[PDB]
């Protein structure tokens, strides 16, 4: 038993991380086959960081200006191109450690593993959720841009996040691997703010199921609610609406525990209206919402 | 900015994980050079281990590295772990050493099932010597480790779960952490305590990340803090702990006994419904080294 923030094994991604240096700027790149993917702000010079013209900066640059290093080996850049906010550097060597992979743009409330990287060398791995306001609560210092987020399904690495920047509140913003930012953010050092976040309701319910699986059952009761009645309460407390598909996805956890999803919604309703009253759930005094139903299933179910 | 429970990259360990089978019992093994390390209980079948090992033969041992069949050349006892010599050295063997960690120290765990890694998480050895981890059946043989400059220091191998849901295991020398044995005895973990020096490091991490509502003007003596900490089941803070917190004290400009008065206030009065680094409880699974490694800022 037990329950912990559990990331996917990072070995398949570690073999793809490279260092990309353009002038005085060094960050991380993702080397898949013969293409290196990295944030386009690597070409950004101190001359204009408020609102640079990335098309102008890319034209003022050639293949030889991009220093790409994989460990001790220098990769030769053969071509470069710009896709939205991501730079693509074609190299003469295909990464022999390229795993089976695909690019995926995830939905808010989904989680992924982040391989934090500096100078092309992985430093650590941890779990992150795509917040409803399209930020993530990561751990990133200067030089960590180009670190990627991912999920691994049947040995296929689904890349979903590339880190770009940190917002004034300390939350983090990035793009998918096609260069499209999550949220309304832009890759410029301007005064930007995320919108007000909301709690991922289906994830809280999954975490409650994980609590029951681990013998934490004090919050349960005999009451049941309708989907409509619960979603009225969820609105009052700044919780995301719960859909019928959310109920279906929680089905395996309901099977494991014996607690109907609408029964667990009644428990969550009472938790929101009364609080924990000094008690804890899975070693936490707050309702955790960064665990998806699939995360609980993969960790707490054989 | 930001502070999260971060595990070490698991790739160097992933290439050493194998599956070891004995009759109907199957668990995980660690393949370094021509030796596979596995829990001794696998030889036991649904306990005088020495006799069962004598009765056991090499062909009774089935070791699979993915789908590569490893031929067992011999088997020897390593305390509560079993060393299976195989005819092939692991080509992916990293630079490594076997290290026994102290209570309060942290490490990353690669949870594995049938020789295949499922997930990586960061755990801390408890003062009781139990580890609070996430293990299902078949996870025995999963290992805990730290990585420093591409050298893997293996410190833990998982053996079993205690009745309270906490986990017990050995180091890679087969010596069990705590008084636990790999038998069916009614062993139970001793009363656990909170790792005081880790909480202080985590408070320093919060200050570095701008979370500092808990700072106050008071400074406590070491003994006055320890008497309060004892009342709340906190481990005593030693002068060596104070010395270890020196670098974080210098970076933040907050004396250690100044921070201790903050912790004393939090213990006696609670958090008043506020959070520190996203948590409404006091966190004790981050060493001072863990803070410097991630909050370099
Ligand atoms: Na103080």
Numbering used by the authors:
A (entry chain B): 1 to 302
B (entry chain A): 1 to 46, 52 to 302
Show passages lifted from the paper.
The main protease of SARS-CoV-2 (Mpro, also referred to as 3-chymotrypsin-like protease or 3CLpro) is responsible for the majority of nsp processing, cleaving at 11 conserved sites along the polyprotein including self-excision of Mpro by autolytic cleavage of its own N-terminal and C-terminal autoprocessing sites. SARS-CoV-2 Mpro is a functional homodimer of two symmetrically disposed protomers that are each 306 residues in length (33.8 kDa). The active site of Mpro features a Cys145-His41 catalytic dyad, which orchestrates nucleophilic attack at the carbonyl carbon of the invariant P1 glutamine and the formation of an acyl enzyme intermediate central to efficient peptide cleavage. Using C-terminally substituted Mpro chimeras, we have determined X-ray crystallographic structures of Mpro in complex with 10 of its 11 viral cleavage sites, bound at full occupancy intermolecularly in trans, within the active site of either the native enzyme and/or a catalytic mutant (C145A).
Cleavage site C8 has crystallized with the same approximate unit cell dimensions and relative Mpro dimer orientation in the crystal lattice as that of the earlier structure for C5; however, the C8 crystallographic data is defined by the space group P212121 with four protomer molecules in the asymmetric unit (ASU) compared to space group C2 and two molecules for C5. C4, C6 (form 1 - see below for definition) and C12 also share a general relative disposition of Mpro dimers in the crystal packing but C4 and C6 have higher symmetry belonging to space group P22121 with three molecules in the ASU with the symmetry generated dimer contributing its C-terminus to one of the active sites of the non-crystallographic dimer. Using C4 TSAVLQ as an example, the substrate adopts the same extended β-strand-like conformation as C5 SGVTFQ, with the P1-P4 backbone, in particular, superposing near perfectly and maintaining the common hydrogen bonds for P1 and P3 residues. P2(Leu) induces a distinct active site conformation in the S2 subsite with Met49 and Gln189 (and surrounding loops) changing orientation to create a deeper binding pocket in which the isobutyl side chain is buried, sandwiched between Met165 and Met49. Gln189 is more extended and forms a single hydrogen bond between side chain Oε1 and main chain NH of P2(Leu), an interaction common to all Leu/Val P2 substrates. In the canonical form 1 binding pose (C4 for example), the P3 position of substrate points outwards towards the solvent, away from the binding groove. When the cleavage site region binds in a standard extended conformation (form 1 structures), the P4 residue occupies the complementary shallow and hydrophobic S4 binding pocket (side chains of Met165, Leu167, Pro168, and Gln192) which are remarkably closely positioned in all captured structures and in part influenced by the rigid Pro168 main chain conformation which packs directly against the Leu167 side chain.
